[PDB]
Amino acid sequence: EVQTKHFTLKSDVLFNFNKSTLKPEGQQALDQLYSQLSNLDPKDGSVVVLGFTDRIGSDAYNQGLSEKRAQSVVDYLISKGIPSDKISARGMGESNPVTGNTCDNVKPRAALIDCLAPDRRVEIEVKGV
Questions:
Q1: Which of 24, 53, 120, 129 is the most buried (most CB within 10 A)?
Q2: Are strands 87-93 and 46-52 parallel, antiparallel or unpaired?
């Protein structure tokens, strides 16, 4: 609109394996960004929280975790003062990976997790501000 902003957070800092409760350090990271994350036109400002994992979803073994995580972030952000009707969560899963083809030839489980780190992420889009 007048200004759209973008934020990216590491899932490995925000969440324990297979879980969607925000870790302390992840709470902190959301605090550190809430100032700028919440300056939106109270009329037509909007916030979208997008959960991602990597192409083997190493992040989790149960399903729905990327939606859950996105919603956990939403919930926290609402408990900081973003109104509900202004913010929504989406679970993108393996979609739109950042790493591209970079890790296709990485076979060992550990190294492949290291390599796919960039894909294990929560993105936040802010329209308005």
A1: 120
A2: parallel
Cβ–Cβ under 8 Å, residues 11 and 121: yes
CATH of the domain at 110: 3.30.1330.60
CA-closest candidate to residue 120, choices 31, 18, 21, 36:
18
The resolution, in angstroms to one decimal, equals 2.5
> What six digits make up the tokens of 1?
């609109």
HSE-up of residue 66 (Cα within 13 Å, Cβ side) = 23
Q: By residue range, what is the domain housing residue 57? A: 1-129
Question: Is 11 in contact with 122 (CB distance < 8 Å)?
Answer: yes
Domain count, the chain: 1
Euclidean distance between CA atoms 118 and 9, whole angstroms: 10
d(C-alpha 73, C-alpha 48), whole Å: 10
> Are 70 and 89 spatial neighbours (Cβ–Cβ below 8 Å)?
yes
The candidate with the shortest Cα–Cα distance to 6, out of 49, 53, 63, 62, is: 49
